[PDB]
Every structure is written in structure tokens, then in C-alpha cells.
Design an enzyme around this catalytic site. Structure first.
Site, short mmCIF file in Angstrom:
data_model
loop_
_atom_site.label_atom_id
_atom_site.label_comp_id
_atom_site.label_asym_id
_atom_site.label_seq_id
_atom_site.Cartn_x
_atom_site.Cartn_y
_atom_site.Cartn_z
N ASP A 14 0.87 -1.12 -0.15
CA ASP A 14 0.09 0.02 0.05
C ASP A 14 0.96 1.07 0.03
OD1 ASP A 14 0.96 -0.83 2.49
OD2 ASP A 14 -0.67 0.24 3.52
N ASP A 27 1.59 4.89 1.17
CA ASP A 27 0.85 5.63 2.06
C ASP A 27 1.22 7.25 2.11
OD1 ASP A 27 -0.14 3.55 3.68
OD2 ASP A 27 0.94 4.04 5.30
N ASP A 74 -3.48 4.92 1.39
CA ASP A 74 -3.84 5.48 2.66
C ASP A 74 -3.63 6.67 2.97
OD1 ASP A 74 -3.82 2.65 2.93
OD2 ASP A 74 -3.59 2.72 4.99
MG LIG Z 1 -2.07 2.51 6.13
#
Ligand SMILES: [Mg+2]
Ligand code: NA
EC number: 2.7.7.31
Length: 356
Positions: A196, A198, A280
Site C-alpha cells: 500500500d 501511504d 492510505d
Molecule cells: Mg495504511
């Protein structure tokens, strides 16, 4: 040399000299995490983390004769590696079926131990028998985790990472051109890959309302363009003066983005055009930004010790948003990460020296 027991007083880059032991410990360790065995998990992590910081490869038990966080239950698993060259224990967990299904199931976006165990007991052992089962019910998260399972398992490059960062800017920069979008997490720690991408976002001018709606405004924008494949926007649950608990985050935002392959400049120069990406977004008050970055940059262990060191050694409470001194009964501020380290009274460790 005197190797601190805290990862925050240790320099752990991506130059592991003990993967042999390391992956053994992380496996055993990760197994107690799936085994709801909170205690032994800790042991392995501390130990694994420590080794990852060593400047040399352990070739004998004698080399152990000093390092901290090296308990019996461990040196015994170490001794097996040194000899056999591999780990009977480590190897075992790998085959354990409960383990294997927990990993495999859990590897789906929206799947945690709860739902993982759920499916286990139901006798499920594969994601094919799980998706197809015309009975079970799935969350939108799990639907999304499944729908894009394929691409999410795939690692994410710095190219792809950077590729996302442009996107996250052209958007944020549009609704708040006076905002700073810095890439956090593992890539920010020097890693070549990650699962992911960020980002921590902040703005000087940003007001309460503004710094708030911003996150929706951005995702809206991504929705209007079919780049928003999933989106969960948790509103902040932080009061300013809520000292570090002995949850509580800023308005963060979990989501899957549609990365159009055309925007990724790599050494590689197709089927769909694009690749599903986990992303995120964390929104934060300009005055606390230094704690969010330290909070959103690696690693679990670094963050883990930074905190216990903070308390157990300085009678201070570190947060992802504050650093309270229980003695001076005062909240310390930091315009930078360096300041925080300074406050805790620690030599500064760089983002890449934080892969504990
Ligand atoms: Mg995260
Ligand atoms: Na999961």
C-alpha cells in the site's frame, strides 16, 4: 558497542545479514499473531528486530553472547538454523494448515482473524471454495478485496508508488494548493516494494472545516473519474489535548485506486491498462505533522519501542499526535521529527535506519 534493546536506539537499514534467522523468527512470530498468542509473538519480534540491525551474519552461538532480547526459547531456534541450516520449528508452522489458511484468507482485503477463523471452522481452505460458496456473505471491503485480489497481492514499485503520489497531489493540490503531501510508510523507509502506498497530508492555511472536507473532496474527484475503486473515510477521533493513551487517529482514509499503467515510468516499456492499488491518506493539523510522520513511517517494531522507551525510560507519552511529559506535566512540541527524537533524548535515526 553495547546494543540497545530499543529499536529506536539502534540503526536498522535494509541490509539484513541474518535473513536466515530473521524469516524464521518472523514466521514463528507471525504464527503466534494468528494463534492469538500475544505474548510469545513479542519475544520473536524483539529478537528478530535486534538481529536485523546486526552489521554481521551470526555464524556461531558465540556471536550471540552479548546481544539483548535473545532468550532461550529463541537461541534454541537459532542453534537449529546454525546446524541444520534451516528451522524445524519455522518449517513446521509453514505446513501447519491452520496457519496456512489464516495467512491465505487474511491476505484478502477486508479479512482479519475474526473472519479468517470463521471460514476455517466452516472447513473452508481455499479462496476459490470461499468465493463460489453460494451461501456465505461478504462486506463491500471483502468484495473489493476479492474483486481485486489479483493485483493487490502483487507488490507495488517505487515507480508505481511515485505514480500514485502524482495523482494524490494533482488532487490535493487542487483543493488545497498550500498543502504538503509526503509519502510515508515503507517506501519512505527506503523499501523497493510495498503493499500500500501511504501519504500524510497537511496544510498551514487549512482550517478545521477545510482540513476536514478535503479528504472527501479528493475522493469525490477520483470518483468522478473512475479511479476510486473502493473508499472508506474514517473521520478523526482525536481531541487536541488527549494525551497519549497509556484507535485515536486523525481523519485517515483507506482506499483502492485505479492506477492507469500509462502513468508509470519504469524500466518496463498490457491487458487491462491499469492496476488496483491500496492507498492510505492521513490528514493532519499543521502543528502536529511531526508526530504523524513519525507515527506513519516505519516500523511496527520501531514504533513499538519508541513508545515503551518513551514511557519506561523518560516518563513521557508519545502519540501519533502529541508527546506529553508526565513529570513536567507539559506537552512538548516538535516542528520536525528530529525535535521529537531530541525530546525523548535520542540520537536521530533516519527513515531508512528505521527498518527494525
Ligand atoms: Mg495504511
Ligand atoms: Na486482511
Amino acid at each position: 558497542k553495547k546494543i540497545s534493546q530499543y529499536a529506536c536506539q539502534r540503526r536498522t537499514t535494509l541490509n539484513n545479514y541474518n535473513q536466515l534467522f530473521t524469516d524464521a523468527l518472523d514466521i514463528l512470530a507471525e504464527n503466534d499473531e494468528l494463534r492469538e498468542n500475544e505474548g510469545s509473538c513479542l519475544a520473536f519480534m524483539r529478537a528478530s528486530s535486534v538481529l536485523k540491525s546486526l552489521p554481521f551474519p551470526i555464524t556461531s552461538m558465540k556471536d550471540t553472547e552479548g546481544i539483548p532480547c535473545l532468550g532461550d526459547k529463541v537461541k534454541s531456534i537459532i542453534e537449529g538454523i546454525i546446524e541444520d541450516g534451516e528451522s524445524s520449528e519455522a518449517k513446521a508452522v509453514l505446513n501447519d494448515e491452520r496457519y496456512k489458511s489464516f495467512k491465505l484468507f487474511t491476505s484478502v482485503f477486508g479479512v482479519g482473524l475474526k473472519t479468517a477463523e470463521k471460514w476455517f471452522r466452516m472447513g473452508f481452505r481455499t479462496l476459490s471454495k470461499i468465493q463460489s460458496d453460494k451461501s456465505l456473505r461478504f462486506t463491500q471491503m471483502q468484495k473489493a478485496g476479492f474483486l481485486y485480489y489479483e493485483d493487490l497481492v502483487s507488490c507495488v514499485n517505487r515507480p508505481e508508488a511515485e505514480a500514485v503520489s502524482m495523482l494524490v497531489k494533482e488532487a490535493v493540490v487542487t483543493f488545497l494548493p498550500d498543502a504538503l503531501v509526503t509519502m510515508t510508510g515503507g517506501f519512505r523507509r527506503g523499501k523497493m516494494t510495498g503493499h500500500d502506498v501511504d501519504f500524510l497530508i497537511t496544510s498551514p492555511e487549512a482550517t478545521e472545516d477545510e482540513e476536514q472536507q478535503l479528504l472527501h473532496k479528493v475522493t469525490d474527484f477520483w470518483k468522478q473519474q473512475g479511479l476510486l475503486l473502493y473508499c472508506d473515510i474514517l473521520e478523526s477521533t482525536f481531541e487536541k489535548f488527549k494525551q497519549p493513551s497509556r484507535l485515536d487517529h486523525f481523519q485517515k482514509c483507506f482506499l483502492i485506486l485505479k492506477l492507469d499503467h500509462g502513468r508509470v515510468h519504469s524500466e518496463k516499456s498490457e491487458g487491462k491498462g491499469w492496476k488496483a492499488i491500496r492507498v492510505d491518506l492521513v490528514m493532519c493539523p499543521y502543528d502536529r505533522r511531526a508526530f504523524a510522520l513519525l507515527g506513519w513511517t516505519g516500523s511496527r517494531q520501531f514504533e513499538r519501542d519508541l513508545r515503551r522507551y518513551a514511557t519506561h525510560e523518560r516518563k513521557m507519552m508519545l502519540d501519533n499526535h502529541a508527546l506529553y511529559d508526565r513529570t513536567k506535566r507539559v506537552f512538548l512540541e516538535a516542528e520536525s521529527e528530529e525535535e521529537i527524537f531530541a525530546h525523548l533524548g535520542l540520537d536521530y535515526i533516519e527513515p531508512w535506519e528505521r527498518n527494525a
